[PDB]
Amino acid sequence: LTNKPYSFVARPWEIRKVSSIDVLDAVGSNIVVSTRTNEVLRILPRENEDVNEEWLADKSRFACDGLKRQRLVAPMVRMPNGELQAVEWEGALIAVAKAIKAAGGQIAGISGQLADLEAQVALKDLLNRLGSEVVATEQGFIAGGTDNRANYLLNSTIAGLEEADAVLLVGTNPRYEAPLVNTRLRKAYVHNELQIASIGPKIDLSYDHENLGADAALVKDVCSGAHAFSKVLEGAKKPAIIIG
Amino acid sequence: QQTLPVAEVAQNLPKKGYSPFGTKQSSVAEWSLARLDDLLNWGRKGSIWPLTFGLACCAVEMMHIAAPRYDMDRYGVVFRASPRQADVIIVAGTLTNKMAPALRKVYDQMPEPRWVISMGSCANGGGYYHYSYSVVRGCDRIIPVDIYVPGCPPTAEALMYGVLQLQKKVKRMKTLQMWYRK
Amino acid sequence: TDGGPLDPKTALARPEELEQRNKLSGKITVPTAVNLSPISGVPEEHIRERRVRIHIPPKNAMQSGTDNVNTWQIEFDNRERWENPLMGWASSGDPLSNMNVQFGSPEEAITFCERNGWRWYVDGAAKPKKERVKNYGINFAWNKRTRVSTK
Amino acid sequence: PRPLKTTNPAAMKRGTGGRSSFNGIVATVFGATGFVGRYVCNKLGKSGTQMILPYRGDDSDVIRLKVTGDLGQVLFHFYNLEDPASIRDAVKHSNVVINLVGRDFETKNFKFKDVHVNGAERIARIAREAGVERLIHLSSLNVEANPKDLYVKGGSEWLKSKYEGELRVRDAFPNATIIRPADIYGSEDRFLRYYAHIWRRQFRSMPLWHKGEKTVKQPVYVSDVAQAIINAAKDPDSAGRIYQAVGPKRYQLSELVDWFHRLMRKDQKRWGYMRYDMRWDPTFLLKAKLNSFICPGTPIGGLHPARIEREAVTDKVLTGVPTLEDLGVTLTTMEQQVPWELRPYRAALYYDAELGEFETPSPPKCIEARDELRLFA
Amino acid sequence: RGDIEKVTHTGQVFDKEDYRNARFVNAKRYVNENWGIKLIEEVPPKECTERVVFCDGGDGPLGHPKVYINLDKPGNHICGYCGLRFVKK
Amino acid sequence: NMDYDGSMIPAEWYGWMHYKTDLPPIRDGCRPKYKWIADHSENLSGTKEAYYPYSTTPNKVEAWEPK
Amino acid sequence: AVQQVRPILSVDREEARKRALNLYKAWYRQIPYIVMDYDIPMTVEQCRDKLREEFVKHRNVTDIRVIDMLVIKGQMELKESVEIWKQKGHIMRYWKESQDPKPTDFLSKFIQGVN
Ligand SMILES: NC(=O)C1=CN([C@@H]2O[C@H](COP(=O)(O)OP(=O)(O)OC[C@H]3O[C@@H](n4cnc5c(N)ncnc54)[C@H](OP(=O)(O)O)[C@@H]3O)[C@@H](O)[C@H]2O)C=CC1
Ligand SMILES: CCCCCCCCCCCC
Ligand SMILES: CCCCCCCCCCCC
Ligand code: SF4
Ligand SMILES: [Zn+2]
């Protein structure tokens, strides 16, 4: 059984192996990238027991072709005739600087999904130095949850989620959103006899599970204690609640 | 790419002649300068004098055109010790970091016209010691090269192929006709 | 001692020469933190610019063997490679991009980098071993979800 | 604002500043055989520029230019200024065309109009029709419409030819970086080699026009001109501009010649060097005319009446026209290079001298503005 | 000259705006006229009776290493070394 | 005439001239003759029809193409 | 910390400083014989300024064994310059006369290339 995107491309003694971390999934799985003669070849797992444990998703592995297609190689400026034309770096930089000087106080910035920590820090430093106190992120969040980490953190460890006894999914599909968390939940289902209830539509989690419903009011009911899975979570030794 | 012609096509073609500049040039002065250039290139492609240089193993092959199987003195080619009394320097062997000003000085003190034969893989592009610290990556980046003999030890057949191709390059070398058309 | 002929370069030497030879035969006190950047012959740009990663090399995920994992190594940061316009090879202006230096412990590599003056950092520590129980009776179990469906 | 034409990942700049890399410039260097062309080719090959070098003569004249570039960055071509098809083949894949084509003397096949005017028009028109972005054709410093003859009858045809050529190139190619250099000093030049030669001096005596006092020159070093050509090629803002190329300080010709013979270990007493006015000497002009006549190629020592008019004229800069400091290049003083440059032309090199045998000569005096206006009054 | 704009069997040709076609004004481009794809689909497939067949390049020790191809699946089975096609009716 | 060199000998007579085999190609029935075997060519260096190398792989990184 | 090692030609820092000053004196005497003999385009004052810069970039070291290794290497270059033992191509290597200087500001480094 052989990688078909990596069909006869290179050889394993030739490969420069560089340690990296995949960014497409939110697991942050440790990978090793096969680079030979200044080209990406394939993505392979690197063993971190806490994060991924020799396992990699198909989206994280078979997206080495996406670094070859639809790339941006030149700085482009929309000329006033209506077309985006490739220009030099210095002309693009002074055009963006002239647009910034023409803005005069109304400047905002949005961070995406592939941005690292350092570009976000540099963007926030540029906006705060220019007098703009507004920054943005593409995926939304609750109001007031920024100050405490635990509102946006998988506080139970991914290596600790294999020791969970009963988990509750509130509107998430961990088979596709973060698949190594689903491998940890499958390991805890096989070994630790985990019983799992989910809230939302019917989903296949690659194991047997019960769907409580699609209404949000029963999300209160598990927090109220009237539902039997609230008694399951209270009687469990290591409970958890996973929210998408 | 063209191939050698078939013997019927070869019988259709006439003889090439000794002169690479053609028989007639539609001018008396052009014909006289072309024949003077032919005499000069005959005197220059006859008896080029290589230089006793011999950096490395490829040099041992250089004595196999001295050795009586191949006989470089049959062609006029004869070794001279001084670079002033030499037309050719056969850079043959590993050119290292300490031999960069040595080869540049010996090439510069050699008088014009100058043709350099690069014999051997070390002299062409570094070869088996290309990725080392001390070896200069070929002798092109210090001195000009006109002939690249490709074998690591070339056969002395293959070295005299480079010598004969240098003689054909000198035979096609034109200076008086260039002076008339400059 | 022996009643033979004495050594003439020690008997005829001045008292300043006897003091000079005995002081070089002794042991001086030096700090153990020694910077050897001007001695090693490295250009100063690679000293102030390159970052050194000390790491245990990654196991090949397609291969069960761990013999190549059993060492630590020093490697240097990857600079720009490019395509030469003639023929299409991978030209590189980085002389240190191809050097992996083997070491036994990260403390030895840290002291070596402090000796040679490199800007060092450790990517990851030594991997702890988790005790996992493996036996054949779990595959065929009674009222357990770990009963295997293969075979 | 400034568009990028190529938009190909093989064509963009990549790598560091070495020879094996690519700087994104594909330069065609016309007249690369000559004195400026070697330094221009070396300064291009230091940055990894792919160069097309067209030669009009023999292969042995341009075989020495393979050293400057790496493998694949030097491509030789055969051209002639009477054939536009070879120039069309030469500049068809070039972003930069450098015109160093010129000749100091008349030739039986090419006159001054045929090499400075008409050949420049053929090169500039073919480069404009081939889509070449830049053109860095050179000029002379003292170009004028009607340059008056100072000594000889028939002189200053070269300056008029370069002037007519530079306005017709600026008419034909609308944005050409015209560089006007003064007398250029270097190795293999004509300026130091003309004064150092046997045929210029007469019986160990040096003939100069007005004893060298009334001629003020501002010479420029050749790598400064070459690096100015590189900086004009790399900067797109230098297009359609005229750049004066002079040195940092001004000298008069008598002080320059006396300093040259002080550097050459040719003093007043031991060697017998003396300076006398060339205007009272009718032998030297007949000698220059005979040297220009009987030589089938280059005259011996570069001695011809055009060289006499080139050294006779005074180097005058025009206010409002930018110098080489606008191009970002530093300028090299003669006190850094010419003591090394006149080392092979020193007299009595057989003498195994000690350290204090020969004294280091004094640097020459530099003429100021007020002294120049007092001298020219 | 048509060898500059000719396409090799790896699907490579230089563009008209590329500077790398300036290397071919003095030396002609080498494109191999014998593409391996056309000369391997010109060879007809071999009809066989046995369930498995062996291939060794057709020369013995001078061919490729001997491999066995299964023919129970319908269609044309391609040897991965030499490209010869086998079929079972 | 005066253009002979060692590259004019074809591939079939090359081993007979270099004493590799004692069998001439007239009676050498083991030498193959295929449809794709090209005719012999001499060394074309120093000629307008020489060989000059290039990259055989195409471009592996594709740009955007905004339109 | 503390370590007992064998010394190289000096016990304390004062002798190593004396050896470095002896190197400076010997290189000062050797510079005018370097200039007149090697056929290099460098004035004597430029040579002495380059010698001063070579000592300045090694003023920062403090360890006596490192200082004495530098003294041994400088004595080797002095011995390779008293006897000629070299060419003009290697004497000019201290000045780096062929390398074009690179800018240090971040905008020019951003425009030129990733290095
Ligand atoms: N002191 C100086 O040198 C000064 C020079 N300039 C200008 O700078 C430029 C370069 O100067 P420089 O290097 O010294 O001059 P050179 O005479 O040394 O070089 C001129 C170049 O042009 C070529 N050439 C000459 N005539 C023709 C022609 N008819 N057709 C085609 N090519 C020809 C020569 O080729 P080849 O050698 O093969 O015959 C050579 O490569 C010229 O335009 C000159 O006017 C201006 C002021 C001072
Ligand atoms: C061999 C004699 C050469 C004479 C050259 C001219 C000398 C002029 C001297 C004028 C008075 C200083
Ligand atoms: C060959 C002789 C040249 C002499 C040049 C000097 C003449 C000095 C006297 C001038 C009188 C007008
Ligand atoms: S090319 Fe081969 S035979 Fe010649 S010197 Fe190098 S290793 Fe020796
Ligand atoms: Zn097969």
**Dihedral sign (CA D101, D102, D108, D111):** positive
At residue A201, what are phi and psi to the nearest 5 degrees? -75, 175
Instruction: Please choose, from the candidates B99, B57, B104, the residue with its C-alpha nearest in 3D space to the C-alpha of residue B83.
Output: B104
> Is G84 touching B (CB cutoff 8 A)?
no
Option in G32, G36, G113 nearest D15 (CB): G113
SS3 for chain C, per residue? CCCCCCCHHHHCCCHHHHHHHHHHCCCEEECCCCCCHHHHCCCHHHHHHCEEEEECCCCCCCCCCCCCCCCEEEEECCCCEEECCCCCCEEECCCCCCCCEEECCHHHHHHHHHHHCCEEEECCCCCCCCCCCCCHHHHCCCCCCCCCCCC
For tokens 């693009």, what's the residue? A92
Surface-to-core class of residue C96, CB atoms within 10 Å of its CB (0-12 exposed, 13-18 middle, 19+ buried):
middle
Partner residue facing E19 (CB), from D76, D89, D93: D93
User: Which residue shows structure tokens 């498995």?
Assistant: E52
Binding residues of D for NADPH: 31, 33-36, 56, 101-103, 162, 190
At position G2, the amino acid (one-letter code) is V
The Cα E36–Cα D313 span in angstroms is: 71
Q: What is the largest CA-CA distance in chain A?
A: 69
- How far is G66 from G72, CA to CA, in rounded Å? 10
Pick from A110, D150, E12: which is nearest to F55 by CA? E12
Nearest to B160 by CA among F7, F19, F17: F7
**Radius of gyration of chain B from its Cα atoms, rounded to whole angstroms:** 19
For residue D192, give Cα distances in angstroms to D290, D301, D311.
Answer: 22, 10, 12
| Amino acid at the residue G97 | E
Buried b / exposed e over D219-241, threshold 16 CB at 10 Å, is bbbbbbbbbbbbbbbbeeebbeb
C-alpha to C-alpha distance for D73 and D52, rounded to whole angstroms: 8
D136 close to D229: Cβ distance less than 8 angstroms: yes
Q: Can you name the residues that pair with B115 across neighbouring β-strands?
A: B88
State this model's resolution in angstroms. 3.4
Tokens at residue E13, please? 């040709």
Residue B139, annotated ligand binder? no
Q: Give the closest residue to D107 by CA, choosing from B180, B30, G113.
A: B180
Take residue E74 and report the two structure tokens written for it. Answer: 């319908």
**Pairwise CA distance, residues D193 & D187, whole Å:** 9
Task: Give the whole-angstrom CA distance, residue E75 versus residue C21.
Answer: 91
E78 beta partners: E85
In SS3 terms, D68-102 reads as CCCCCCEEEEECECCEHHHHHHHCCCCCEEEECCC
| H-assigned helices in D91-155 | 112, 118-129
Which approach determined this entry?
cryo-EM
DSSP H/E element including A239: strand A239-243
Residue A40: strand pairing partners: A35
- Pick the residue whose CA is nearest to atom 9 on ligand 2: D276
Query: Can you tell me the distance from the alpha carbon of D209 to that of D223, in angstroms, rounded to the nearest whole number?
Result: 29
**DSSP 8-state assignment for residue D159:** H
Ligand 4 centroid vs B132 CA: distance in angstroms?
Answer: 15
> What is d(CA C59, CA A106) in angstroms, rounded to the nearest whole number?
51
**How far is C116 from C110, CA to CA, in rounded Å?**
10
Q: Nearest ligand, CA of residue D278?
A: 3
DSSP state of D14: B
Which whole-number Å values give the CA distances from B153 to B64, B158, D22, D221, in the listed order?
A: 11, 9, 34, 46
Q: Is A237 exposed, middle or buried (0-12, 13-18, 19+ CB in 10 A)?
A: exposed
Q: In angstroms, rounded to a whole number, what is the distance separating the alpha carbons of residues D1 and A88?
A: 8
Q: Is residue D369 left, alpha or beta, with left meaning phi > 0 and alpha meaning psi from -120 to 50? A: alpha
Please provide residue D36's backbone torsions phi and psi, each rounded to the nearest 5 degrees: -75, -30
Cα of B121 from ligand 4 centre, angstroms: 6
- G111's enclosing H/E stretch is helix G106-112
For residue D75, give the nearest of D83, D21, D85, D89 by alpha carbon: D89
In degrees and rounded to multiples of 5, residue C40 shows phi and psi of -70, -15
Distance CA D146, CA D142 (A): 11
Q: How far is CA D48 from CA A186, D24, D69, in A?
A: 58, 9, 7
Q: From D7, which residue of chain F is nearest by alpha-carbon distance?
A: F63
Residue type present at position G20: A
Q: Is D22 helix (H, G, I), strand (E, B) or coil?
A: strand
List, in order, residues 6 or more apart from A220 with CB less than 8 Å away: none
Work out the widest C-alpha separation in chain F, in whole angstroms.
68
Q: Which one, of B142, B100, B94, lies nearest residue G90 by Cα? A: B100
In Å, how far are B50, D57, G43 from B40, measured between CA atoms? 19, 17, 47
CA D148 to ligand 3 center in whole angstroms: 26
Q: How far apart are CA E27 and CA E47, in angstroms?
A: 47
Distance CA F52, CA E4 (A): 12
Q: Which of C116, C120, C37, C115 is nearest to C76 (CA)?
A: C120
Whole-angstrom Cα distance, residue A233 to residue A241? 9
**Which contacts (CB < 8 Å, 24+ apart) does range C141-148 have?**
C144/A193, C145/A189, C145/A190, C145/A193, C146/A190, C146/A191
Distance, in Å, from the CA atom of A183 to the CA atom of A204, rounded to the nearest integer, reads 13
Question: What DSSP letter does each residue of E53-65 carry, written as one string?
Answer: EEE-TTSSTTSPP
The residues, ordered by sequence, that sit 6+ positions from E37 with a Cβ below 8 Å of its Cβ are: E9
Distance between CA atoms of residues B22 and B35, nearest Å: 10
Q: Pick the closest to residue B116 from B54, B163, B57 (CA basis).
A: B163
For A107-142, letters b (16+ CB in 10 Å) and e give eeeeeeeeeeeeeeeeeeeebeeeebeeeeeeeeee
Rounded to whole angstroms, the Cα distance separating D336 from F58 reads 50
Report H helices in chain A: 58-61, 89-103, 117-129, 174-177, 179-191, 217-224, 228-235
Pick from F56, F59, F61 the residue to mutate for testing the A interface (most A CBs within 10 Å).
F61
CA F21 – CA D367 distance, rounded (Å): 85
Q: Which residue has the tokens 């009054």?
A: D377
CB F15 within 8 A of CB F22: no
Question: CB–CB of D324/D246 below 8 Å?
Answer: yes
Q: Which residues contact D303 (CB under 8 A, 6 or more apart)?
A: D194, D197, D199, D200, D287, D288, D291, D292
Tokens, residue G15: 């002798």
Q: Measured between beta carbons, which residues in chain D are less than 8 angstroms from residue G41?
A: 336-337, 339-341
Does residue G41 have a cis bond before it (omega within 30 degrees)? no
Rounded CA-CA distance C28/G7 in Å is 6
H or E, element range at G70? helix G64-82
Q: With H, G, I as helix, E, B as strand and everything else as coil, classify residue D157.
A: helix
Chains contacting C (3 or more CB pairs within 8 Å):
A, D, F, G
Pocket of ligand 2 (CB under 6 A): D 203, 205, 274, 276
Contact D253, D216 (CB under 8 A): yes
- Residue D17 burial by Cβ neighbours in a 10 Å radius (0-12, 13-18, 19+): middle
Give the 3-state secondary structure of residue A45: strand
- CA trace torsion D237, D240, D246, D247 (10° rounding): 10
Number of helices followed by number of strands (H, E) in chain G: 5, 1
Say whether E27 and F36 touch across the interface (CB within 8 A): no
Neighbours of chain G (3+ CB pairs under 8 A): A, B, C, D
User: How many residue contacts between D and F have a Cβ separation below 8 Å?
Assistant: 5
Sole residue written with tokens 């940890």: A184
- Cα B115 vs. chain centroid, distance in angstroms? 6
Whole-number CA gyration radius for chain G? 18
Give dist(CA G73, CA D348) in Å, integer.
37
Q: Are B110 and B71 in contact (CB under 8 A)?
A: no
For residues F15 and F9, what is the distance between their CA atoms, to the nearest angstrom? Answer: 10
Nearest-by-Cβ selection for C86 from D14, D18, D71: D71
SS3 D7: coil
Q: CA B53, CA B50: separation in Å to the nearest integer?
A: 9
**Residue A153 CB: number of other CB atoms within 10 A?**
8
Contact D60, B113 (CB under 8 A): yes
Q: Which amino acid, residue D128?
A: R
| DSSP collapsed to 3 states, chain B | CCCCCCHHHHHHCCCCCCCCCCCCCCCHHHHHHHHHHHHHHHHHHCCCCCECCCCCHHHHHHHHHHCCCCCHHHHCCCCECCCCCCCEEEEECCCECCCHHHHHHHHHHCCCCCEEEEECHHHHHCHHHCCCCCECCCCCCCCCCCEEECCCCCCHHHHHHHHHHHHHHHHCCCCHHHHHCC
CB D205 within 8 A of CB D273: yes
Give the other-Cβ count within 10 Å of D88's Cβ: 15
- Rounded Cα distance between D129 and D124, Å, is 9
CA distance D299 to D290: 10
Asked whether the beta carbons of residue D7 and residue F63 sit closer than 8 angstroms, the reply is yes
Residue whose pair of structure tokens reads 């699946």 in the numeric block: E73
Contact B53, B86 (CB under 8 A): no
Q: Are D228 and D329 in contact (CB under 8 A)?
A: yes
